[PDB]
Symmetry: C3
């Protein structure tokens, strides 16, 4: 119930230093972020690439290897959220602004420029390589972190923290030791920079749309603060205000506005061409899955390092930053699901929705390029979605609807992050003081502004460089959550009696052999 | 039993509407079919491609899930057919003219012309594409349709109708009024138009068999009528008459005769080159399985649209239209057989026989092409097999036995279609009227003839256009069968007791949560 | 206790005839080997390739199947060796000089020359095709043979022979009769020529290692005779006097030191960029490489396959008879599923990391420009690589000591096993019977090395393919024999007995119903 000042103070100091450094000295901060990315991507990029696909293997195995039957709670327990409602709150908190910002930019960018090891103007690899970054590899990080927290919190009954998930690996003395503190600090620093990156990427696109919709003429440096201040003041209140409906209501407004914007483009846009990419993109994704997972800085004659540092290694570092707080939320909602249900509900359902979104939006953008109409414009990634919407008839009203979607796809996740950061500040208490939950909401905004204003002309690169550095320390925490998780699952109360017999029989068999050899 | 006159008449009107429209207005029928094919392929082409692979995935998780152990019948039941004789009737009924007609022409056509997104003269792609069209995607449609009927008929004791398999979705009342009747005429129309495509294709190859054997000099239009007339008598006599050991003897004769012609080509032909292709075709098939499963009209920079309508979408429509009556037959001969045992038996064993078949005949044809001696000839698909056989020693005598095998590969499947069609008009009576079984056999021959005389030179094109159109309505019945199947399986007696406790506990937990939220909500 | 002279004599005649033939008439022996090699590769090339992949499929399906839980021994038994000590002795005994000889020659050869159907200078396929030959296809033959012997010996109580694992097919009378003596003769000839092929290659690399290290001025045919004789006594001494566990652990520690040396002082980061780039490519092309016959590349693959793929498959099949009975001996009380995974995966993991450190470090040198190819002799690639790295003059000698233990641990277990197939499956075989087979292996090793002249590699390869062809069909027949007696387990007869009775009634009812209705 205390404030665990051994976790708040180290996390505040790093956050405050970034705000002072980024805002105070823009030139120095930008150079360090560029230098830090090169060292991280060069000497550590293999870790993201190698372990990014180990998570997918590890999770699928855990969902079939004798543990899919265990239940995240007590035996005979039942889920407190109906399946349809349960799925809605996980994709709303799981996804922020990644289907809006990159829904059109990414599949279109790979169509024009191409991907390393391939040619340009290829719709098979433009779409398949987009599904690679948004279907299984990213959502397998949430399952691993969410499952480790869900099991320890419910089956074993420990505090709601990320250190407690490591009790098997570092014992109970280490959960209160220097390691327990460090694992918890890295979960807040990752979350603050993980959300601040998506706040900065959503403030750019909301401001970009206003120029399109002409509510405003063009974004300015003060406009970004205005958008961030409104977005910050929205999720900060929605998290810590009893008035209004909870996250289960907002999580349902997301899936309604998102389906409104997807159905509009699907119907108005090239329906038949969109429907043809759905099998072609899934078929190309499954045949190229391992070929794409084996792409490193050594691929394409060693020239793919620059591409990976902006597309793959950024996404993997981005999703890992959101895992510490999207794992804790996913744990809260399950409370009764079996390991198989949790794994297959997180891996397959969010992956199916992301497949349809990118074919409706990525397919429309690519189809426009083939036809002759090009929504690329000046190339800015923020302006591409609204250039597509405005091309379609009736897009003026939908351009406005896309803003509410942009704002409401970050509020659902940002508010959950604050309430999840608040519980780490205390000793895993579900109820968090509204002041610490509001204090962390401001921290993401202060970082979100710092990464945007400091970036200047190129604010995307600065927002992406800092995320990769802030997520590298927590990449290893996720790797060590695979070993901690298996130790917990093996030492289950429904396996202790069976494991004791094997320990006894194994000891005797060794004793018989050593004595038998002498005789 | 009482004839289902509410299904015979609406289905018979479609059949007779096409016959008069085809013989009398050949000029206007071909135009409509070609225009209909364009409308279907352009708009619903993705459906065949997208859901042709969901069937493979759906019937693999079903076999691998907890439903695999279920037994198609009571618990403690045991199959009534020797597992060897179960396969023989499974393959004999499930396959007809296909292997004989496209055994040589498909692998050779892809070797010369190539496939979209690939170069010509590529043996790996040529062989790994004909295995795609004939191994797992086609036989996964039979398993889904056959399993839905087998489960409802035996495990749940409903009537043997395609409507009854939808009771989980539309209910016992929906399955009777108007949706059930629609699903029961779309199944008869698909069966009539799916078996008429095989009859037309078989008559074309039989006519070429007599030209190559020189028994007939020139196949005119009055000999095709002679061939179809003999064939339609063959499977009407077998279907209705109680003598002759209709099945388990003519189905066992098909393996004996099918293997005799495969062994002849294997040993007389390039045996070592055939065996070198066998591991290369399977390896290439599994490597490119998902590249071919995602080949839509957007492939080859938009050039694949015309290719798919001739090979991929035609096959998926050809197999979709045969699944109403193959699935119904596979249910009867698979009583007491578990779900996993049923799915693996259908998916794997028939897929293995096809793989060996196309290596011996596709490999021999491709090997000849490389050497310099080409059996392509003029390029008619109906004359390739006999061009291959006559290029080997002893082919003259062995070309006559290919025609007999060609006929017997239709009779074993056409007689089971007429019998199943009669059952669909007897409210599911296993033994239907002889004059309803025979009437439906004559209907199949009438349409098969109408699509040959109407086409003229492009007889094959007219047969493929109509099959795709007739099998489009049933594409959605198969999509719906895989939604009513999981509900049927889920609501099983063995799982019913456990489900009730889980629902009961879930309601309490949900109610407990909402109350706690209210208690915290107030203050 | 008897020596089964009716199996020893036929084995000796084939072994002795080869020694006289090769030494007596080198020209005739070399000409016959080339003629026989072409005859087998053309006619039976598909058999090695077609059934090479069926072994991988067959073993995974058996571990997946219900049989996976059957325990090799009595119900509720426990293993005699710790999992780490059991793993260490399976790899040391199952791997001879293959990793040392081809650690740098194979991945580097494919980078320069390419592979059938692919362009040259491709690091992706150089490493992906290198792991094809050393990860799953090879180690799956060991599990098929090791499992058939382990199951029949322990869970059925039959004598520890290769013929005793065939009684489900040939019957008890057949195994005692003639077919089961030819299976024992072929099981001896294959292991004599397989172990002599690796002894020949080991002597070439040690002979080249001495010349490179300046210990011996030049490599002379009379110098190699000294190496083989010295190597002959080491493994004969270990299998006779009063061991395996100690030397198998000295293998792993000493080998891991050599791998750590190259890893640390080589391009560490570039090595790690290939760890996921080779696993991704391996899984991508697994079925493209698994379906590579002589028909691939339009007849150009026939000459390549006989040198790389069909050679390895015949080389690993040669070692299966005696690695099968060694794997069975130490795997008492392990479940079938635990046996398959402990053999297929862990040795594949060590091989995958071995070639990345050594194949990667040799390919980067090619890319940089400093090529270690030199003259191009396969036996000099390793010592070119080590000398390039700093400190490779002391680590270039430990490679030769590591070439001794690698062969000695496997050769020590070959003689012990070869002396058991002659004494009616008696574990404690006569000391002189092991010695007799120990020097018969050395005589064959020299015969192929001397008769080969300048091209000693081709003579060793052409004769192991012919010697391992008869035993290709014994492994193909072990899949059927293994399935026959796995089904007929004590924990399935009651279930199988009831099912057959019910099925017979169902057939009887149908036949009676048919008569009633047919009338
Ligand atoms: C050169 C590269 C070649 C290799 C390519 C990569 C291969 C990766 C393979 C990874 C194997 C993982 C080993 C664990 C297998 C999982 C399945 C399993 O063990 O299931 C058993 C139960 O599970 C266990 O007891 C052990 C499971 C492992 C514990 C979890 C550890 C994490 C493993 C994650 C996978 C590895 C991820 C790393 C990357 C592959 C038995 O299952 P069952 O009894 O429920 O079903 C069979 C039924 O009875 C008969 O039909
Ligand atoms: C996420 C998809 C987007 C693409 C990205 C991922 C790449 C594709 C991966 C393909 C995964 C498909 C298979 C995953 C489904 C797992 C199903 C499973 O594990 O078990 C269930 C499966 O059982 C089924 O119901 C059938 C599932 C059908 C799955 C078919 C998958 C089709 C996907 C193919 C796409 C087509 C692509 C076109 C060609 C490119 C059991 O549930 P149940 O509803 O039967 O009830 C169980 C129990 O009673 C509880 O009450
Ligand atoms: C690349 C070339 C590969 C070619 C062939 C490889 C496959 C052959 C090896 C696998 C078969 C060995 C069978 C070993 C005995 C296990 C039998 C067994 O116990 O059944 C279990 C394991 O058996 C299997 O699942 C068999 C799987 C066969 C795998 C076939 C793979 C080859 C096909 C690949 C796809 C390509 C298709 C052909 C090309 C068109 C599963 O069922 P269950 O025992 O749990 O319950 C029984 C129930 O009644 C069901 O019968
Ligand atoms: Na959200
Ligand atoms: Na047939």
């Amino acid at each position: 119930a205390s404030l665990n000042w051994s976790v708040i103070v180290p996390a505040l100091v790093i956050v405050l230093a970034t705000v002072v450094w980024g805002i105070g000295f823009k030139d120095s901060f930008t150079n360090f972020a560029s230098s830090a990315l090169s060292a991280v991507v060069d000497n550590l990029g293999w870790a993201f690439i190698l372990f990014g696909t180990v998570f997918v293997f590890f999770i699928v195995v855990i969902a079939a290897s004798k543990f899919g039957t265990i239940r995240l709670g007590r035996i005979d327990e039942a889920p407190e959220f109906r399946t349809v409602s349960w799925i809605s709150m996980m994709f709303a908190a799981g996804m922020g602004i990644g289907l809006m910002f990159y829904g059109t930019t990414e599949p279109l960018t790979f169509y024009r420029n191409g991907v390393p090891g391939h040619d340009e103007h290829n719709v098979g690899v433009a779409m398949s390589t987009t599904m690679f970054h948004w279907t299984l590899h990213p959502w397998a990080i949430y399952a691993i972190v969410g499952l480790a927290i869900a099991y320890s919190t419910f089956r074993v009954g420990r505090k709601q923290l990320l250190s407690s998930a490591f009790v098997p690996l570092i014992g109970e003395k280490g959960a209160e030791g220097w390691l327990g503190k460090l694992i918890d600090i890295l979960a807040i620093i990752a979350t603050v920079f993980g959300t601040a990156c998506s706040l900065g990427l959503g403030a750019l696109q909301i401001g970009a749309g206003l120029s399109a919709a002409n509510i405003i003429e063009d974004p300015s440096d003060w406009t970004i603060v205005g958008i961030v201040s409104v977005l910050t003041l929205a999720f900060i209140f929605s998290a810590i205000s009893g008035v209004g409906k909870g996250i289960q209501y907002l999580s349902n407004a997301n899936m309604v506005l998102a389906a409104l914007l997807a159905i509009f483009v699907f119907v108005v846009g090239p329906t038949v061409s969109i429907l043809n990419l759905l099998p072609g993109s899934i078929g190309n994704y499954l045949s190229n899955f391992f070929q794409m997972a084996g792409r490193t800085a050594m691929s394409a004659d060693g020239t793919a390092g620059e591409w990976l540092g902006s597309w793959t290694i950024f996404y993997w570092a981005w999703w890992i930053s959101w895992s510490p707080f999207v794992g804790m939320f996913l744990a809260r909602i399950s409370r009764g699901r079996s390991i198989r249900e949790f794994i297959l509900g997180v891996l397959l359902v969010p992956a199916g929705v992301s497949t349809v979104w990118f074919s409706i939006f990525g397919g429309t953008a690519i189809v426009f390029e083939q036809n002759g109409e090009s929504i690329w414009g000046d190339g800015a990634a923020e302006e591409q979605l609204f250039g597509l919407l405005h091309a379609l008839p009736g897009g003026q009203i939908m351009g406005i609807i896309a803003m509410i979607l942009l704002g409401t796809f970050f509020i659902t996740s940002a508010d959950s992050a604050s309430t999840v950061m608040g519980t780490m500040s205390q000793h895993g208490q579900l109820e968090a003081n509204k002041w610490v939950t509001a204090a962390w909401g401001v921290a993401t905004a202060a970082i979100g502004l710092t990464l945007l204003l400091s970036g200047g002309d190129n604010a995307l690169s600065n927002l992406q460089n800092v995320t990769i550095v802030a997520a590298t320390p927590f990449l290893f925490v996720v790797i060590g959550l695979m070993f901690a998780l298996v130790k917990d699952l093996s030492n289950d109360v429904i396996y202790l009696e069976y494991r004791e017999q094997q320990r006894f029989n194994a000891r005797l068999a060794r004793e018989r052999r050593v004595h038998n050899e002498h005789r």
